[PDB]
Amino acid sequence: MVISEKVRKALNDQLNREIYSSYLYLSMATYFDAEGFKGFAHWMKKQAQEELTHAMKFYEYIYERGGRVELEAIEKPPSNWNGIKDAFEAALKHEEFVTQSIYNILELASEEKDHATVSFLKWFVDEQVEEEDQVREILDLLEKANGQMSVIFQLDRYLGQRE
Amino acid sequence: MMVISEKVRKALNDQLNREIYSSYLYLSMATYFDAEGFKGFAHWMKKQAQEELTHAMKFYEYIYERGGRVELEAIEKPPSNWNGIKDAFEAALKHEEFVTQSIYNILELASEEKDHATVSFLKWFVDEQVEEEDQVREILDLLEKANGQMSVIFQLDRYLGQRE
Amino acid sequence: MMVISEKVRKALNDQLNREIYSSYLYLSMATYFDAEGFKGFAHWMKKQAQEELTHAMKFYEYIYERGGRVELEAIEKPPSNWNGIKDAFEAALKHEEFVTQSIYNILELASEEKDHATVSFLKWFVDEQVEEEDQVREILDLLEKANGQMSVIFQLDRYLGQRE
Amino acid sequence: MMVISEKVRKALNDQLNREIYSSYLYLSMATYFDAEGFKGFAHWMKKQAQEELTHAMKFYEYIYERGGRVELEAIEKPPSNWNGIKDAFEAALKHEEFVTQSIYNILELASEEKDHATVSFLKWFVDEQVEEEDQVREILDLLEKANGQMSVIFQLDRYLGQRE
Amino acid sequence: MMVISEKVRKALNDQLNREIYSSYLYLSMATYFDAEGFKGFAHWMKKQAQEELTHAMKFYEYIYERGGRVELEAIEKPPSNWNGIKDAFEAALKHEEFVTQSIYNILELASEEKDHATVSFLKWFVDEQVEEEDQVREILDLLEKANGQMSVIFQLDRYLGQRE
Amino acid sequence: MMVISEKVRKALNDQLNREIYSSYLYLSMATYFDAEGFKGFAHWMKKQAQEELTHAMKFYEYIYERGGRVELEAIEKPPSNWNGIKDAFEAALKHEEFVTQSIYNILELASEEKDHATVSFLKWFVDEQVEEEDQVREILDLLEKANGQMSVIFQLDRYLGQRE
Ligand SMILES: [Fe+3]
Ligand SMILES: [Fe+3]
Ligand SMILES: [Fe+3]
Ligand SMILES: [Fe+3]
Ligand SMILES: [Fe+3]
Ligand SMILES: [Fe+3]
Ligand SMILES: [Fe+3]
Ligand SMILES: [Fe+3]
Ligand SMILES: [Fe+3]
Ligand SMILES: [Fe+3]
Ligand SMILES: [Fe+3]
Ligand SMILES: [Fe+3]
């Protein structure tokens, strides 16, 4: 194995955090479906799948550097939010935490002069920018919407079309 | 409003969480197979893991169709190591037969309450479990015949590595 | 909420305005070249002007992506004459090297603040600058090959007039 | 040798710089719409800005075609903040009617000098201004009817964000 | 003008000559495999040799984009013999790891000089080295499982002989 | 078992290494043309370098076809500087005439030993050398007709730069 044990641990930890992110977004989906917003729930199911592809990227990079993955327990996520906007605020807060988590691996890797891992992490830096922005844009629309059901209906239909 | 009983909703939600754990267990077998250098076996387990997620989502959508709600529970840490190829596939067979029995138990509970809609919904899973168990028994039979011979194991690994 | 610091956001916004000026400087070179008859040199500077606008719009979109705002500033009047071609293209090269250094300064600022998102975003512009600097250095080498001999300098005009 | 009067050249060069300012103004409106989170309004304005650059390039090319030369001037800092969506489009309409009058003044100067070429050339801009004022007047009428209502404003934003 | 330090141009020109030796070493490994009758292993090494040339030429073209010059140095005689298949691929892995550390040293030199253009250029090679090391490690894992068994080795020769 | 004599195998293995040196020499010439800003001439040389590698590999494969083995030798540092474009191409023609004579020497040795397989194999290179020499002579003649006229030189650079 040509990554350090400390960097293998950080990458393995982040893999498990990506799995939890997936599970959290699935849990938000369960909340949206309970509230009858099939389009919002669909957006979250697609988000969950996207998080799984991030975990598998960490998975394959670890083995590529001679390491091994160990899967850990996945914590029980919240299952309820105080309305659609509250759920997206929690999504944003979670994405920012993920970003900082990725930043911490990057700085560790840089400090150990593990350039291969620094470079690998660049894709996740850029992807985090995009994911934060998607949620921020949804939140700004919802702020403008205030309560309006007609606006919320359209947003649900639109996010219901995510590929 | 919910037209499944709370008992049947809990049994269905429990099984959804068991399907999620099944997925995680198979991903963990993949981590084992990748660590041992058998990328084909690992690929097979990653595809199996995706399959168990589709099962979880089938329970999910039926729960909502009947006015219920899903609650995701913590996922237990799976084992991450086995004593060999065969040991891992045998643990998979044992797990699948446990899943089948778990499904049988919901089926008999639904049947006792005369929830015919749920009994009928579970037929898909009864038939799928028959295929799932059989696929692992087949693999175990090929491994029994292979014995140690890496010439055979290489071809099995390549073969399972082609699963779509 | 804005997730770049106000220092980095001003550095990005300043550079956005510098890219707008670069576009205007090159259009002003196109006015010189077009006046002196060298239309091909001019068509090349109009293409370069359009390119610098795409640079500006990249800074623009990133600023909003990070929750900042863009503020457009006054654009200074650019030169409109140079002492012959090689004077102009040498002013271009010197300008692009100033752009490159300006970008480098943003990168080092972001790095010092641990704004890895802005550091990563700026890589594109580092790599582009390498290429912008080089296409000009190239043209300055060709002109110096044509001595002061006019019928070759016109030949270079026709090739730069090919830029897509 | 130049076959437009220096007075007509200056009037055309002035208008060229005015079209550049118009482009920059509409870009500044875009920065406002984007700051306010209306990406479709912002997109309309980015397309308007590109269209004003082509207007400037038509003046650019006619000037050199008649033997004149272009001199680019300083570009003033455009405003950055409007009271609300409707006020921004109202300022766009006011700006376009000012551009039209600016064009009208070139036309009547050219016509007094019997510069029939420049008169005929300006016709395209006269007809284009009629369309661009009309486009903004339509948006303003929709925004008038919407009154404050965010549901309708959102529909207009999506519609205007389709502009090709 | 050359806009890379002479220290950096030396480290890049040196690495280019190292890439050339790499190509030659793999060709020499091909000469070994072909003498042993393993045309598929030989073919893999001939493809590897060509790939190292694309690496050398990438350094080549960057050196000139930064205004530098390439000087080709003498190439040492590579080893022509190995003590079995495993020994040859182990030597290949040790060489790629040396090549990776060589690239790392250039990156740390460039970074200490704030030569961001070169730091960025070298990212491609950091990522490519990860893949190169991994392909060799994978080959060495399959070889370890094969043990000495010709029946498996012939399978591996077949697979590596497919490399495009 | 090797069915060429060791003397012929040595001569064929020496020529293989000479073809490798040819490839390296023509790349060094590329480094000179690129330093002098003639990217088309450099392109022609890089293409020639790859052509020389296909010559080396033809020798490589014939050696093994007759049961011999290839041994790669050290590659001498080539010159990197010429006193102009014509000087470099004169050095190329001189090199190809030396390659031609080296091939003649093998052919005469093989004919002495009544190695008719190898005599026949070398026919291809006799004919190819005639064309490799003619190609450089045509370039030298175009350069002579150019005299020192940078205009025509530029057209020759662009043309040779379209070599496939
Ligand atoms: Fe993620
Ligand atoms: Fe994410
Ligand atoms: Fe299942
Ligand atoms: Fe199953
Ligand atoms: Fe730029
Ligand atoms: Fe630029
Ligand atoms: Fe206009
Ligand atoms: Fe207009
Ligand atoms: Fe390499
Ligand atoms: Fe390599
Ligand atoms: Fe040759
Ligand atoms: Fe030759």
PDB file of N, CA, C and O and ligand atoms in Angstrom, chain F residues 15 19 22 26 48 51-53 55-56 59 96 99 103 125 128-129 132, ligand 11:
ATOM      1  N   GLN F  15      22.306  -3.086 -36.944  1.00  0.00           N
ATOM      2  CA  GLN F  15      21.473  -2.211 -37.757  1.00  0.00           C
ATOM      3  C   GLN F  15      20.203  -1.788 -37.013  1.00  0.00           C
ATOM      4  O   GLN F  15      19.736  -0.655 -37.170  1.00  0.00           O
ATOM      5  N   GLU F  19      19.115   1.966 -36.542  1.00  0.00           N
ATOM      6  CA  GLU F  19      17.814   2.558 -36.841  1.00  0.00           C
ATOM      7  C   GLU F  19      17.273   3.337 -35.638  1.00  0.00           C
ATOM      8  O   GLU F  19      16.698   4.429 -35.798  1.00  0.00           O
ATOM      9  N   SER F  22      19.022   6.533 -35.629  1.00  0.00           N
ATOM     10  CA  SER F  22      18.428   7.392 -36.655  1.00  0.00           C
ATOM     11  C   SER F  22      17.199   8.106 -36.109  1.00  0.00           C
ATOM     12  O   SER F  22      17.003   9.306 -36.339  1.00  0.00           O
ATOM     13  N   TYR F  26      16.850  12.255 -35.763  1.00  0.00           N
ATOM     14  CA  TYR F  26      15.803  13.075 -36.345  1.00  0.00           C
ATOM     15  C   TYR F  26      14.945  13.781 -35.295  1.00  0.00           C
ATOM     16  O   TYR F  26      14.503  14.903 -35.536  1.00  0.00           O
ATOM     17  N   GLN F  48       9.490  11.589 -39.178  1.00  0.00           N
ATOM     18  CA  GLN F  48      10.592  10.754 -39.645  1.00  0.00           C
ATOM     19  C   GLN F  48      11.095   9.860 -38.527  1.00  0.00           C
ATOM     20  O   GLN F  48      11.373   8.681 -38.744  1.00  0.00           O
ATOM     21  N   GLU F  51       8.989   6.964 -38.284  1.00  0.00           N
ATOM     22  CA  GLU F  51       9.235   6.062 -39.400  1.00  0.00           C
ATOM     23  C   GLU F  51      10.464   5.214 -39.127  1.00  0.00           C
ATOM     24  O   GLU F  51      10.475   4.003 -39.394  1.00  0.00           O
ATOM     25  N   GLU F  52      11.492   5.824 -38.534  1.00  0.00           N
ATOM     26  CA  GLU F  52      12.699   5.069 -38.242  1.00  0.00           C
ATOM     27  C   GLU F  52      12.423   3.966 -37.226  1.00  0.00           C
ATOM     28  O   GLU F  52      13.029   2.895 -37.282  1.00  0.00           O
ATOM     29  N   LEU F  53      11.553   4.225 -36.259  1.00  0.00           N
ATOM     30  CA  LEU F  53      11.198   3.175 -35.318  1.00  0.00           C
ATOM     31  C   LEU F  53      10.525   2.010 -36.035  1.00  0.00           C
ATOM     32  O   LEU F  53      10.767   0.852 -35.689  1.00  0.00           O
ATOM     33  N   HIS F  55      11.317   1.047 -38.882  1.00  0.00           N
ATOM     34  CA  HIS F  55      12.431   0.327 -39.488  1.00  0.00           C
ATOM     35  C   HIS F  55      13.105  -0.556 -38.460  1.00  0.00           C
ATOM     36  O   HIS F  55      13.384  -1.733 -38.726  1.00  0.00           O
ATOM     37  N   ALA F  56      13.338  -0.020 -37.258  1.00  0.00           N
ATOM     38  CA  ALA F  56      13.931  -0.824 -36.196  1.00  0.00           C
ATOM     39  C   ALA F  56      13.094  -2.077 -35.925  1.00  0.00           C
ATOM     40  O   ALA F  56      13.629  -3.187 -35.788  1.00  0.00           O
ATOM     41  N   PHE F  59      13.452  -4.975 -38.380  1.00  0.00           N
ATOM     42  CA  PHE F  59      14.635  -5.762 -38.039  1.00  0.00           C
ATOM     43  C   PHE F  59      14.368  -6.623 -36.807  1.00  0.00           C
ATOM     44  O   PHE F  59      14.727  -7.807 -36.767  1.00  0.00           O
ATOM     45  N   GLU F  96      21.312   9.329 -44.014  1.00  0.00           N
ATOM     46  CA  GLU F  96      20.612   8.271 -44.741  1.00  0.00           C
ATOM     47  C   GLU F  96      21.532   7.530 -45.717  1.00  0.00           C
ATOM     48  O   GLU F  96      21.364   6.313 -45.918  1.00  0.00           O
ATOM     49  N   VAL F  99      23.270   5.137 -43.662  1.00  0.00           N
ATOM     50  CA  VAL F  99      22.380   4.018 -43.350  1.00  0.00           C
ATOM     51  C   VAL F  99      22.300   3.075 -44.545  1.00  0.00           C
ATOM     52  O   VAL F  99      22.375   1.850 -44.395  1.00  0.00           O
ATOM     53  N   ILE F 103      23.312  -1.003 -44.705  1.00  0.00           N
ATOM     54  CA  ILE F 103      22.434  -2.050 -45.179  1.00  0.00           C
ATOM     55  C   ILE F 103      23.106  -2.842 -46.299  1.00  0.00           C
ATOM     56  O   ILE F 103      23.002  -4.079 -46.366  1.00  0.00           O
ATOM     57  N   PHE F 125      14.597  -2.812 -47.688  1.00  0.00           N
ATOM     58  CA  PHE F 125      15.324  -1.657 -47.210  1.00  0.00           C
ATOM     59  C   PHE F 125      16.167  -1.027 -48.298  1.00  0.00           C
ATOM     60  O   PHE F 125      16.407   0.184 -48.255  1.00  0.00           O
ATOM     61  N   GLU F 128      13.658   1.017 -49.880  1.00  0.00           N
ATOM     62  CA  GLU F 128      13.177   2.104 -49.019  1.00  0.00           C
ATOM     63  C   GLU F 128      14.231   3.198 -48.889  1.00  0.00           C
ATOM     64  O   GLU F 128      13.894   4.386 -48.883  1.00  0.00           O
ATOM     65  N   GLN F 129      15.509   2.815 -48.816  1.00  0.00           N
ATOM     66  CA  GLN F 129      16.590   3.796 -48.724  1.00  0.00           C
ATOM     67  C   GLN F 129      16.641   4.693 -49.951  1.00  0.00           C
ATOM     68  O   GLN F 129      16.825   5.914 -49.834  1.00  0.00           O
ATOM     69  N   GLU F 132      14.005   7.131 -49.150  1.00  0.00           N
ATOM     70  CA  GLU F 132      14.353   8.023 -48.050  1.00  0.00           C
ATOM     71  C   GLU F 132      15.382   9.052 -48.506  1.00  0.00           C
ATOM     72  O   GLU F 132      15.338  10.211 -48.075  1.00  0.00           O
TER      73      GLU F 132
HETATM   74 FE    FE G  11      15.689   3.730 -41.424  1.00  0.00          FE
END
